[PDB]
Design a binder for these strands. Structure first.
Lengths: 84, 306, 48, 81, 73, 74, 177
RNA sequence: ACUCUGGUUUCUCUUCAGAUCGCAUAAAUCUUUCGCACUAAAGAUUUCCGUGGAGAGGAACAACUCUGAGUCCAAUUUUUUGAGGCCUUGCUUUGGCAAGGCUA
């Protein structure tokens, strides 16, 4: 009644390797440490593909969830209990 | 042979009369019910076992019917009710309780929304959306109705009864549009083709009619008249069915003979023995030329017609 | 220790079957009345 | 609240221009309180593209620029409370 | 809000705010229209199909959902 | 019901903020609100012209903040 | 057809389906106490003798339905033979187990108080009637006699309040749903 | 927040029940064991006292509590906007798309 299913799947994706695209086209693949009700994602050990194609290694990242276009989660969470 | 199953093989297990028999439209299972207050689900092929049983009628089952989906089975009973069942695990998903007398008929809406037009001995022809749990529209016929059916469009109801006339009611006009007159006694059985243009009629004038329920009106809809049939002192609800290719009609008779005519030739193709009582409903398999027949002899006769 | 579990019956009752016969009737009596009645009836059975 | 006027508008064939210029012509089926518009019999022309026939659509309510209602609409009996 | 509970597990096409297409199995949603789509393939224009997996699409960037296919077995 | 963004991991840390219009900034975090506006000590601006511009204590609206990178090890 | 030959046609069909699919064409007595009192007072042998086989059932059903010492009179349903050969106490002595244990614990209290009070307790002589003395007719000297109080323990209205209205009944709350 | 089930009690029948069917406990018979069998144990069967469940049938009064079903949010973080306009190429399906640079 209060919290939705996709934020439960986002909380279920913590510890896993998620790849989050942001509003400025930058793709961040790495270990999602923590995520909140708003989609503020503290992630770590991040491989970053910018818009040009350059890849950087940013070891501790906190993305503001407003700017997140989407996150690609592991398909393990296709069997997560809140997706039933 | 020209089928998959055995020859003339019999179905025993009904404890009293069988008033209605219907084929599942996929053609691998079978439903038969009657005076037992108890629907039996058979297998069409194989050893013809009885794999499931449906209890939940407090009175005899007047009309069994299947939607073209085939998953849910509609059952107009004698008491006051029409039950809606499922066919796989077999529990009554719904009761429909609005008629004040003996419900003689039901019919599935197969194309659009799942509507069950029913008719009963009070005269009310009631339509039943299953999500409403109530009577949508009640067409008040002054006399008893013994057989009701939809058209192909599911936008008209075709009720045959004891008023000597077949009466069609429009679902949007909410009036009787025209009265198919030409019967001399109570009209007991109405069935409509898969292509939906023609409609069969059985009555206690011992004659069978074919009408053409269609918007294109030829101003006298009694195109084909069939003889051979008889209605007796038992005064049952002698039902009807169409072949899925539309080539053969079958009307249940009171002289223990499974009747099958040709639509074009207007002659009795099949006059089959074996039954001992008045034959209430005779049905057609959807895929193969197989005929089941339900009669008062507490038995069913499956059989390869061709 | 010697308890074996009770065995599968068909639930016949003796007094319901007596009540189903024309030879038995139902009433409501004082217990000391049927006490004297059972003592007299057993006395009559043993003397018979 | 004017969105309540739109959820009274069930089964109307309206066009909707979005913020991406895409004009969606179809019979409206459902409205949320956030104008989440669910449509059927959809003829959607995404702009700078040829129009595509699709059987069902569900626009998010934020992304609607405007609606276009037909001539035959009785809004004087629709915007009452 | 049953108008999209009608669409769960249907293979849906989600046109986004940049113009990208998400053809994915519609698993879940919430009040903010954040979608959970599984086995989601991105379609962009020059045509190419880019498999992603389980996409948590934030609702800000969703324009329009539409069904591509019936739910699988 | 606005919960604060979970940033005591990042307090007193050297972070590089990305800001909205392709912009970038560096500095020490000193706190936040539930709206993720960040207060920054030792702020070096670091524009795209390439020359690095120190300010000090600044406040950044949380609307404009794309990402934090903790340059220091948390 | 006509109108009257479509109303009589409906009347003949309503009176056909109303009786053909009628729900009856779908696919015990108590006696007064005196009737058995006169039968055992005034008393085809086969009837009497096929009755008389079940006499230990009568003994067991009588002794198991004994009135507990907080009951003066226990009326029991009795299944008797019409020849008066056997009377069966038909009921089974069902007691709510906390009520039954509480009633017997009150019995323990009151009987200990009475053995403390009655210093020289006079036990019943056994057998209470001698051998060649006929058993008493219930109607002539027991029927109208009032039994001496039973042993129900006095229950004070303050602490025993949810129990005292029904504590010493036969089957205490049997009529209470 | 509007509508349709199902009730409860009692009497009886039928079948299943190795589940403390019994929060209690009998008896008979057979076999075995030792004594030398009420004062003794084991195993098994049976009968009794008398249960639970399901199904069915009657008859008494309750009929919508319950078990279900059908039926107040524009100010950062989502849904009341940073939106719109210019330049080069690859192809133009000469509509324009894709990438980047911009300007606001």
């Amino acid at each position: 009644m209060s919290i939705g299913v996709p934020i439960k799947v986002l909380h279920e994706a913590e510890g896993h390797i998620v790849t989050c695209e942001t509003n400025t086209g930058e793709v961040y693949r790495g270990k999602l440490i923590e995520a909140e009700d708003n989609m503020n994602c503290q992630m770590s050990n991040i491989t970053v593909t910018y818009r040009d194609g350059r890849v950087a290694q940013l070891e501790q990242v906190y993305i503001r969830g407003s700017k997140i276009r989407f996150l690609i989660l592991p398909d393990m969470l296709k069997n997560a209990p809140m997706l039933k | 042979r020209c089928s998959s199953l055995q020859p003339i093989m019999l179905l025993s297990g009904h404890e009293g009369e069988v008033y209605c028999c219907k084929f599942h439209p996929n053609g691998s299972t079978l439903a038969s019910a009657g005076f037992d207050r108890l629907i039996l689900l058979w297998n069409v092929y194989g050893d013809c076992d009885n794999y499931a049983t449906l209890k939940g009628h407090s009175g005899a089952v007047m009309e069994l019917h299947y939607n073209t989906d085939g998953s849910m089975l509609f059952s107009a009973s004698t008491d006051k009710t029409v039950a809606v069942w499922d066919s796989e695990t077999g529990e009554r998903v719904k009761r429909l309780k609005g008629h004040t007398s003996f419900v003689n008929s039901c019919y599935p809406a197969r194309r659009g929304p799942q509507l069950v037009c029913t008719g009963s001995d009070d005269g009310t022809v009631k339509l039943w959306d299953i999500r409403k749990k109530a009577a949508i529209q009640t067409f008040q016929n002054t006399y008893q109705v013994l057989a009701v059916t939809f058209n192909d469009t599911s936008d008209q109801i075709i009720s045959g009864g004891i008023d000597n006339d077949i009466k069609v009611w429009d679902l949007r006009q909410n009036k009787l549009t025209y009265t198919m007159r030409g019967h001399a006694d109570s009209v007991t059985g109405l069935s409509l083709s898969s292509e939906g243009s023609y409609l069969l009629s059985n009555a206690m004038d011992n004659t069978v009619r074919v009408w053409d329920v269609r918007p294109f009106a030829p101003k006298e809809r009694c195109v084909k008249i069939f003889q051979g049939n008889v209605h007796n002192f038992e005064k049952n609800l002698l039902r009807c069915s169409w072949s899925p290719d539309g080539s053969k009609i079958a009307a249940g008779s009171a002289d223990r003979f499974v009747y099958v005519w040709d639509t074009t030739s207007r002659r009795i193709l099949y006059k089959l023995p074996g039954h001992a009582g008045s034959i209430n409903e005779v049905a057609f398999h959807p895929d193969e030329p197989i005929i089941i027949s339900a009669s008062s002899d507490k038995r069913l006769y499956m059989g390869e017609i061709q | 220790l010697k308890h074996r579990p009770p065995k599968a019956q068909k639930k016949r009752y003796l007094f319901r079957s007596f009540k189903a016969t024309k030879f038995f009737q139902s009433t409501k009596l004082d217990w000391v009345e049927v006490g004297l009645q059972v003592c007299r009836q057993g006395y009559n059975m043993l003397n018979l | 609240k004017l969105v309540r006027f739109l959820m009274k508008l069930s089964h109307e064939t309206v066009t909707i221009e979005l913020k991406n210029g895409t004009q969606v012509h179809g019979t409206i089926t459902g409205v949320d309180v956030s104008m989440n518009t669910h449509l059927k019999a959809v003829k959607m022309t995404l702009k700078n593209r040829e129009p595509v026939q699709l059987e069902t659509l569900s626009i998010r309510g934020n992304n609607i620029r405007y609606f276009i209602l037909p001539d035959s609409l009785p809004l004087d009996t629709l915007l009452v409370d | 809000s049953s108008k999209m509970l009608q669409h769960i597990d249907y293979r849906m096409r989600c046109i986004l705010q940049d113009g990208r297409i998400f053809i994915g199995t519609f698993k879940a949603f919430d009040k903010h229209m954040n979608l959970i789509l599984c086995d989601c393939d991105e379609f962009r224009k020059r045509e190419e199909k880019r498999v992603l997996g389980l996409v948590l699409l934030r609702g800000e960037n969703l324009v329009s959902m539409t069904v591509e296919g019936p739910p699988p077995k | 019901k606005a919960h604060p963004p979970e940033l005591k991991k990042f307090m007193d840390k050297k972070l590089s903020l990305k800001l909205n219009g392709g912009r970038h900034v560096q500095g020490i975090l000193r706190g936040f609100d539930p709206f993720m506006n960040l207060v920054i000590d030792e702020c070096v601006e670091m524009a795209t012209s390439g020359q690095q511009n120190n300010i000090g204590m600044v406040v950044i609206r949380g609307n404009s903040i794309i990402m934090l990178e903790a340059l220091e090890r948390v | 057809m006509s109108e009257e030959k479509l109303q009589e046609k409906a009347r003949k069909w309503q009176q056909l389906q109303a009786k053909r699919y009628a729900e009856k064409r779908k696919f015990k007595e108590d006696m007064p106490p005196e009737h058995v009192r006169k039968i055992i007072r005034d008393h085809d042998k086969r009837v009497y003798l096929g009755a008389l086989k079940y006499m230990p059932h009568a003994v067991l059903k009588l002794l198991e339905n004994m009135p507990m010492p907080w009951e003066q009179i226990r009326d029991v349903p009795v299944l008797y033979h019409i020849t008066g050969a056997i009377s069966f106490v038909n009921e089974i002595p069902w007691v709510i187990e906390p009520v039954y244990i509480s009633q017997w614990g009150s019995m323990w209290i009151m009987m200990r108080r009475e053995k403390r009070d009655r210093r020289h307790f006079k036990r019943m002589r056994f057998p209470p009637f001698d051998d060649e003395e006929p058993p008493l007719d219930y109607a002539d000297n027991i029927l109208d006699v009032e039994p001496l109080e039973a042993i129900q323990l006095e229950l004070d209205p303050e602490e025993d309040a949810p129990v005292l209205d029904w504590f010493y009944d036969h089957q205490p709350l049997r009529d209470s749903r």
